[PDB]
Scaffold this motif. Structure first.
Motif, mmCIF file in Angstrom:
data_model
loop_
_atom_site.group_PDB
_atom_site.id
_atom_site.type_symbol
_atom_site.label_atom_id
_atom_site.label_comp_id
_atom_site.label_asym_id
_atom_site.label_seq_id
_atom_site.Cartn_x
_atom_site.Cartn_y
_atom_site.Cartn_z
ATOM 1 N N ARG A 83 37.564 24.869 10.727
ATOM 2 C CA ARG A 83 38.267 26.012 11.298
ATOM 3 C C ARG A 83 37.304 26.921 12.053
ATOM 4 O O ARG A 83 37.630 27.433 13.124
ATOM 5 C CB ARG A 83 38.975 26.803 10.195
ATOM 6 C CG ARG A 83 38.075 27.151 9.021
ATOM 7 C CD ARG A 83 38.857 27.808 7.895
ATOM 8 N NE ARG A 83 39.383 26.828 6.949
ATOM 9 C CZ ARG A 83 39.878 27.147 5.759
ATOM 10 N NH1 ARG A 83 39.913 28.414 5.371
ATOM 11 N NH2 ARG A 83 40.339 26.199 4.954
ATOM 12 N N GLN A 84 36.117 27.118 11.489
ATOM 13 C CA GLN A 84 35.108 27.967 12.110
ATOM 14 C C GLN A 84 34.792 27.493 13.525
ATOM 15 O O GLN A 84 34.564 28.301 14.424
ATOM 16 C CB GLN A 84 33.831 27.977 11.267
ATOM 17 C CG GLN A 84 33.852 28.999 10.142
ATOM 18 C CD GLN A 84 32.470 29.521 9.800
ATOM 19 O OE1 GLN A 84 31.468 29.064 10.352
ATOM 20 N NE2 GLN A 84 32.408 30.480 8.885
ATOM 21 N N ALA A 85 34.784 26.178 13.714
ATOM 22 C CA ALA A 85 34.499 25.596 15.021
ATOM 23 C C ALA A 85 35.444 26.145 16.083
ATOM 24 O O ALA A 85 35.005 26.622 17.130
ATOM 25 C CB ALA A 85 34.597 24.080 14.956
ATOM 26 N N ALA A 86 36.741 26.076 15.809
ATOM 27 C CA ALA A 86 37.748 26.567 16.742
ATOM 28 C C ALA A 86 38.339 27.889 16.264
ATOM 29 O O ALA A 86 39.554 28.022 16.125
ATOM 30 C CB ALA A 86 38.847 25.532 16.926
ATOM 31 N N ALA A 87 37.471 28.865 16.014
ATOM 32 C CA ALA A 87 37.909 30.177 15.554
ATOM 33 C C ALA A 87 38.277 31.077 16.729
ATOM 34 O O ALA A 87 37.921 30.794 17.874
ATOM 35 C CB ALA A 87 36.824 30.827 14.709
ATOM 36 N N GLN A 88 38.992 32.158 16.438
ATOM 37 C CA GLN A 88 39.409 33.098 17.473
ATOM 38 C C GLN A 88 38.563 34.365 17.430
ATOM 39 O O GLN A 88 39.063 35.464 17.670
ATOM 40 C CB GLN A 88 40.888 33.450 17.304
ATOM 41 C CG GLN A 88 41.811 32.244 17.360
ATOM 42 C CD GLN A 88 42.044 31.624 15.997
ATOM 43 O OE1 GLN A 88 42.193 32.329 14.997
ATOM 44 N NE2 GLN A 88 42.075 30.297 15.947
ATOM 45 N N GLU A 89 37.279 34.206 17.121
ATOM 46 C CA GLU A 89 36.366 35.340 17.046
ATOM 47 C C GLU A 89 35.542 35.461 18.325
ATOM 48 O O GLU A 89 35.247 36.564 18.783
ATOM 49 C CB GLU A 89 35.436 35.194 15.839
ATOM 50 C CG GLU A 89 34.547 33.962 15.901
ATOM 51 C CD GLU A 89 33.631 33.844 14.698
ATOM 52 O OE1 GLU A 89 34.145 33.812 13.561
ATOM 53 O OE2 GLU A 89 32.399 33.782 14.896
ATOM 54 N N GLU A 90 35.175 34.317 18.895
ATOM 55 C CA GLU A 90 34.384 34.296 20.119
ATOM 56 C C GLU A 90 35.113 35.015 21.251
ATOM 57 O O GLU A 90 34.499 35.735 22.039
ATOM 58 C CB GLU A 90 34.080 32.853 20.532
ATOM 59 C CG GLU A 90 33.378 32.738 21.874
ATOM 60 C CD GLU A 90 32.946 31.318 22.187
ATOM 61 O OE1 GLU A 90 32.653 31.035 23.368
ATOM 62 O OE2 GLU A 90 32.902 30.491 21.253
ATOM 63 N N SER A 112 48.769 27.759 12.248
ATOM 64 C CA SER A 112 48.083 27.889 10.968
ATOM 65 C C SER A 112 47.795 26.517 10.365
ATOM 66 O O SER A 112 48.145 26.248 9.216
ATOM 67 C CB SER A 112 48.922 28.721 9.997
ATOM 68 O OG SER A 112 48.192 29.021 8.821
ATOM 69 N N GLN A 113 47.157 25.654 11.149
ATOM 70 C CA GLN A 113 46.823 24.310 10.693
ATOM 71 C C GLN A 113 45.324 24.054 10.803
ATOM 72 O O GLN A 113 44.587 24.858 11.372
ATOM 73 C CB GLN A 113 47.592 23.267 11.505
ATOM 74 C CG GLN A 113 47.496 23.476 13.008
ATOM 75 C CD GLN A 113 48.596 24.370 13.545
ATOM 76 O OE1 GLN A 113 49.770 24.201 13.208
ATOM 77 N NE2 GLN A 113 48.224 25.329 14.383
ATOM 78 N N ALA A 114 44.879 22.929 10.255
ATOM 79 C CA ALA A 114 43.468 22.566 10.294
ATOM 80 C C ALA A 114 43.266 21.104 9.910
ATOM 81 O O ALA A 114 43.852 20.621 8.941
ATOM 82 C CB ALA A 114 42.665 23.470 9.371
ATOM 83 N N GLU A 115 42.436 20.405 10.677
ATOM 84 C CA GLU A 115 42.159 18.996 10.417
ATOM 85 C C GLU A 115 40.757 18.815 9.840
ATOM 86 O O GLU A 115 40.597 18.446 8.678
ATOM 87 C CB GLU A 115 42.303 18.180 11.704
ATOM 88 C CG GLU A 115 43.734 17.772 12.009
ATOM 89 C CD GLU A 115 43.844 16.909 13.250
ATOM 90 O OE1 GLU A 115 44.217 15.726 13.120
ATOM 91 O OE2 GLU A 115 43.556 17.420 14.354
ATOM 92 N N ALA A 116 39.747 19.076 10.663
ATOM 93 C CA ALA A 116 38.360 18.944 10.236
ATOM 94 C C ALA A 116 37.802 20.280 9.760
ATOM 95 O O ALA A 116 37.553 20.473 8.570
ATOM 96 C CB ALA A 116 37.509 18.386 11.368
#
Length: 39
Positions: free
Chosen positions: A7-14, A1-5
Motif C-alpha cells: 500500500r505504501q508503494a501506491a500511497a496518496q501522500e506524495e 480501499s483494496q490492496a494486492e501486494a
C-alpha cells in the motif's frame, strides 16, 4: 480501499493535491457518529 501486494508503494501522500481532495471523501466516514450516516 483494496490492496494486492503493498500500500505504501501506491500511497496518496506524495500527491498532496490528491490528499486534499480525498480528505473530503474520507471525512464523510471519519465523522458522522450520532447524525445520519451509513456506518
Amino acid at each position: 480501499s483494496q490492496a494486492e501486494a503493498t500500500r505504501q508503494a501506491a500511497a496518496q501522500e506524495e500527491r498532496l493535491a490528491d490528499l486534499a481532495s480525498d480528505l473530503l471523501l474520507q471525512y464523510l466516514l471519519q465523522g458522522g457518529a450520532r447524525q445520519r450516516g451509513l456506518g
